Amino acid sequence: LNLDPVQLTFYAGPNGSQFGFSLDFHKDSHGRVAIVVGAPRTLGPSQEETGGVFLCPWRAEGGQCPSLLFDLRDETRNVGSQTLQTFKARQGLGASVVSWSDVIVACAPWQHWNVLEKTEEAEKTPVGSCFLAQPESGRRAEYSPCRGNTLSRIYVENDFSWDKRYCEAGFSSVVTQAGELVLGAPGGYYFLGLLAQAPVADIFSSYRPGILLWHVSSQSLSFDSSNPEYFDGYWGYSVAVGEFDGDLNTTEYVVGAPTWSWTLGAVEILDSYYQRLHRLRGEQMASYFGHSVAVTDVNGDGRHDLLVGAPLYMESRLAEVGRVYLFLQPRGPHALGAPSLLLTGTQLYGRFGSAIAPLGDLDRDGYNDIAVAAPYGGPSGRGQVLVFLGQSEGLRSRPSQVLDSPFPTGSAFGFSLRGAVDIDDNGYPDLIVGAYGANQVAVYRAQPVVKASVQLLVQDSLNPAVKSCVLPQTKTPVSCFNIQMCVGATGHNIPQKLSLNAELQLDRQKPRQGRRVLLLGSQQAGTTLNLDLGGKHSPICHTTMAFLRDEADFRDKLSPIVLSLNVSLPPTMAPAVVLHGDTHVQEQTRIVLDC
Amino acid sequence: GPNICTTSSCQQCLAVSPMCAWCSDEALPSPRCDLKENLLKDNCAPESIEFPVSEARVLEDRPLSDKGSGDSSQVTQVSPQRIALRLRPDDSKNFSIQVRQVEDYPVDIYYLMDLSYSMKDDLWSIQNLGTKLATQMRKLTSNLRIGFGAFVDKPVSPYMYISPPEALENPCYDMKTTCLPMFGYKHVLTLTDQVTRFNEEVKKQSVSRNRDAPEGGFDAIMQATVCDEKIGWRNDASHLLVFTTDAKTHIALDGRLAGIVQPNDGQCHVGSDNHYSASTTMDYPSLGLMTEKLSQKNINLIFAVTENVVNLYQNYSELIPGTTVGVLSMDSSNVLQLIVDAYGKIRSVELEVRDLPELSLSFNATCLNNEVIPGLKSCMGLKIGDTVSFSIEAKVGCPQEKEKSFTIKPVGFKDSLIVQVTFDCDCACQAQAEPNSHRCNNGNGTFECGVCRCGPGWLGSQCECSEEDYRPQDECSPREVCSQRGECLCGQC
Numbered sequence A: 001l002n003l004d005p006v007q008l009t010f011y012a013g014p015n016g017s018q019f020g021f022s023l024d025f026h027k028d029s030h031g032r033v034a035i036v037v038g039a040p041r042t043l044g045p046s047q048e049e050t051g052g053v054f055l056c057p058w059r060a061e062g063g064q065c066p067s068l069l070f071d072l073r074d075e076t077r078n079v080g081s082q083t084l085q086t087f088k089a090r091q092g093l094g095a096s097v098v099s100w101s102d103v104i105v106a107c108a109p110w111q112h113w114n115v116l117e118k119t120e121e122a123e124k125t126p127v128g129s130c131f132l133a134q135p136e137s138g139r140r141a142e143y144s145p146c147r148g149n150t151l152s153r154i155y156v157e158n159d160f161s162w163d164k165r166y167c168e169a170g171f172s173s174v175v176t177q178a179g180e181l182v183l184g185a186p187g188g189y190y191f192l193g194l195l196a197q198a199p200v201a202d203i204f205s206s207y208r209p210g211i212l213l214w215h216v217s218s219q220s221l222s223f224d225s226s227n228p229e230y231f232d233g234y235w236g237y238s239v240a241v242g243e244f245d246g247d248l249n250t251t252e253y254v255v256g257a258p259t260w261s262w263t264l265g266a267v268e269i270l271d272s273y274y275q276r277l278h279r280l281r282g283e284q285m286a287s288y289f290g291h292s293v294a295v296t297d298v299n300g301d302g303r304h305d306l307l308v309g310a311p312l313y314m315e316s317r318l319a320e321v322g323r324v325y326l327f328l329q330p331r332g333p334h335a336l337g338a339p340s341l342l343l344t345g346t347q348l349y350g351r352f353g354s355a356i357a358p359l360g361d362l363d364r365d366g367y368n369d370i371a372v373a374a375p376y377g378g379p380s381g382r383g384q385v386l387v388f389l390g391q392s393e394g395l396r397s398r399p400s401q402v403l404d405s406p407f408p409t410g411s412a413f414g415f416s417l418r419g420a421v422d423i424d425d426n427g428y429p430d431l432i433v434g435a436y437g438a439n440q441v442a443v444y445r446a447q448p449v450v451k452a453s454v455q456l457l458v459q460d461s462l463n464p465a466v467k468s469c470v471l472p473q474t475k476t477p478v479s480c481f482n483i484q485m486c487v488g489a490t491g492h493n494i495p496q497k498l499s500l501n502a503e504l505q506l507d508r509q510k511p512r513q514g515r516r517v518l519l520l521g522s523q524q525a526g527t528t529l530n531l532d533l534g535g536k537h538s539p540i541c542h543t544t545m546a547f548l549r550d551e552a553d554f555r556d557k558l559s560p561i562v563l564s565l566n567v568s569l570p571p572t573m574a575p576a577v578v579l580h581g582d583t584h585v586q587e588q589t590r591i592v593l594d595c
Numbered sequence B: 001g002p003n004i005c006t007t008s009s010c011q012q013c014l015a016v017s018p019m020c021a022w023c024s025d026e027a028l029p030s031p032r033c034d035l036k037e038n039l040l041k042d043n044c045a046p047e048s049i050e051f052p053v054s055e056a057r058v059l060e061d062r063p064l065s066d067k068g069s070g071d072s073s074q075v076t077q078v079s080p081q082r083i084a085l086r087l088r089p090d091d092s093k094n095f096s097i098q099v100r101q102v103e104d105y106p107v108d109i110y111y112l113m114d115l116s117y118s119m120k121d122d123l124w125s126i127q128n129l130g131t132k133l134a135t136q137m138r139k140l141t142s143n144l145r146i147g148f149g150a151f152v153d154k155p156v157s158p159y160m161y162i163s164p165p166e167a168l169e170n171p172c173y174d175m176k177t178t179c180l181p182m183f184g185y186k187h188v189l190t191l192t193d194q195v196t197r198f199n200e201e202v203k204k205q206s207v208s209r210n211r212d213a214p215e216g217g218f219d220a221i222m223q224a225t226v227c228d229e230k231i232g233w234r235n236d237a238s239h240l241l242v243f244t245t246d247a248k249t250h251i252a253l254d255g256r257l258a259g260i261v262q263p264n265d266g267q268c269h270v271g272s273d274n275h276y277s278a279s280t281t282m283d284y285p286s287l288g289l290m291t292e293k294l295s296q297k298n299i300n301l302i303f304a305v306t307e308n309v310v311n312l313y314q315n316y317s318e319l320i321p322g323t324t325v326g327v328l329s330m331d332s333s334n335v336l337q338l339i340v341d342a343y344g345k346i347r348s349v350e351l352e353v354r355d356l357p358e359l360s361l362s363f364n365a366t367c368l369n370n371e372v373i374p375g376l377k378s379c380m381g382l383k384i385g386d387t388v389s390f391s392i393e394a395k396v397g398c399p400q401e402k403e404k405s406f407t408i409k410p411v412g413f414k415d416s417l418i419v420q421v422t423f424d425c426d427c428a429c430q431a432q433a434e435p436n437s438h439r440c441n442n443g444n445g446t447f448e449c450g451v452c453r454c455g456p457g458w459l460g461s462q463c464e465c466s467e468e469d470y471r472p473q474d475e476c477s478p479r480e481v482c483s484q485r486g487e488c489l490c491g492q493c
Ligand SMILES: *[C@@H]1O[C@H](CO)[C@@H](O[C@@H]2O[C@H](CO)[C@@H](O[C@@H]3O[C@H](CO)[C@@H](O)[C@H](O)[C@@H]3O)[C@H](O)[C@H]2NC(C)=O)[C@H](O)[C@H]1NC(C)=O
Pocket: A261, A262, A264, B311, B312, B315
């Protein structure tokens, strides 16, 4: 709602693009936050297809960020017969970035790995990897469960089972609250999908430079499945962490399979033991249900809620426009299955739902908020971010704000969206929009929100011929009533330069020269006053006095008086304020005399 | 009868109701803005108001052919072809069109084959097909062009075996066999009627092998459709595209597995090498883009998929109108009958709307040829060359873009109709508007065909008074035309 569109933070990257495929907020232990962006198609050791990650300090003007190296070299180790080796060709370092407690985990899902066992070989297959690093410490603990030495003949022998040659671990990187790192591998089990879990502390403990194999304590890998629906399931395409079970103190992983059950799609909730507590499938085939998955409690009830993206949805306008499915967390026995809000974009081929970013209390509204992105939406397919507030009792169905791509067509503005981290540390979380091949990363800063609570004090009714008030000049006896207005500013971090303007309307329904009551001071049927609330918490109530003419004067006495007070922000750069809540009170006064 | 239109100027009376008119006489300022028959009753007999035309006048029409001689204009299937429409704002007009299948119709057929190892044997059953296909299609054509093309999958690392280096030269090295380097999509044989050249260009095909079941067929369909010049689709022909495969296929954004993210554009890249030049450097096409490009070029599509993946592919037919699925045999020796039934099923009428500008249309179940039987709506039973009647009710306010001509073209047939729909909303007197009517407040009133339209307080019949200034001037009465409260209420004086 309060995300500043007119001013944005622009971060540049390599001319080879991909700067913005994935990104996250690196929360420093000191309390600072900086944006870490993976560019999975930067230059290699010698102009090679590789990845790469940049670390941008949080700023406003922006610029060329420094680069954080993880691993770019074709290693080769001779374990007896097996001369195993790694290949950086199109590794994609930066396709998944997640940060936690001074550690950054950035993945290269398409990194290759071949083991030469004399004549036979393991084939140069994309096992993928995800490299961990504490930039302050400098320690690098690369993690790659799918790296192995089992030669291809063994795979071919029995049933091509328990394979990890092309798992592509790290297609989606997330980290729990405790620091446990979770990685997706869509290609695991012969292009079926597996997951990896390992403590970052344990990963750093068990890692040894040079050697290209380990087990790293009790790292938890997903179970291989022979179910036909899982074939080419593409599990671990997108992952997130949130609390969903009946017990606390445990972190669940939500994983998306956009091709589950013959491109139908699914999303699953897993514990650390991978018990599959809940699984919700898609509705439209080839709609890519699960491309991006987000976890946040926008309802404000505390219990986390689920958002699932289907950018390839074909709306029954059969127009290819994505859709975000919302799932509030209920208190039923087997609840959470039925979706509640189905948000759908407008621009054709917009891919509405490629990036769902939790935002938390974006506008100090008391409920969490979200930002969905359609990378090819908008007027001319540029791509647009749709901010949806909590609003309680569900989610804001309408876009509280629409952020337009300032990038040319095809930049896919809005592929990776992250929020839920107050970058301004002002109770107002910000948003970051990165896009694959964008070459630029945009950051939206939220602005203070002012809720208004408005009340009126007007006499309910009176005799038009009371004749108690006295006109100054003419000295005529007239009836009159007490008109007062009190508007107060609620919310957090309200700016002290507030200049709210209140406009009063007496007999609003009646037109001009059809009006009945009329102000003494200004001789007008309505005025605006600077009812500024800046610099104080108490409401301002400056009254007025409008006279009511004699019976014989007018004839609109049969019409009851309408007293509508409407408060609006001043019209006079960036407003830095968003009026919300009650802003128009129309308490009424009727005319009562005999009939 | 007070009616509704009575309860501002020439334009408003042409927009409030389809029936009421605005007497545009500057000699006489009665209901004025009311029903035209009432205007005759209140003596507006000349009816100076220029009503909107609100009817369709054709500009170009030709009779529907029966069998088709062969000329471009002698095989007319859709009547009419160019009409002009001038509906009034908020008015609905239903007009009928007649479409034909022209019976005999030259056909273009392109055969896309999954050149994977799993159906290499099937390629053998395809070696001698041109003679049989020509024999089975001669009865239902007069100029039958055929062409051939092959798809395997995107030749990228997760799908294409990349080591040992002999796998690049021979992907089936490990089974002690020789195959061809894997390719995305290649243009083997251009569209032609020469069966000898077809069976010559076949038998020269070497299959390849991919790592996984999902094939890259849709990326081949895209380039087959867009490269109309390369494939050689005729300007006037019944287009088909037979597509034979055994397993799943990749969809859009799957290229992230291969690391390629750029979505499928709308250009042709099949170059002189007759191969998909940018297969690796582009994502697989979405189903929506597939439907869009299969309907823009009228290229109907036929799915010859094995029994394993029928349900997967037939469900795509729902999301891609104009396509059919077929249970291809394991040996793929039944594709001849598959193409026969494809031509006998989808060419047997689909009405679809295109480039529609505030408009809405609906067809009232006319069909048949010129009759209207709501019972026999989805009766089918059409053999060939069937006329069909489609009466669409175009419903519209007044669009700001006065000039507009939208196109309606059915599925597959290139014969299209152009509706120059130009809504009439204003008046000729409105263009005149009499800006300085002498009788209206001393020659300053813009007498809009019956209404003065002037003055903040002097806005009467001659811009002289208003509902305001009500009080107990002597005209209708010595009060404030001129009576009790505001202008004049007769009897109240
Ligand atoms: C092609 O489309 C059809 C029509 O949707 C698919 O068949 C239907 O698939 C849905 C799954 O999306 C089935 O619903 C599920 O059924 C299971 C029982 O098997 C139930 O436990 C679930 O709660 C859910 O209701 C539906 O029964 C099924 N119906 C029929 C008539 O087949 C079909 O699967 C699609 N082909 C594919 C995906 O290859």
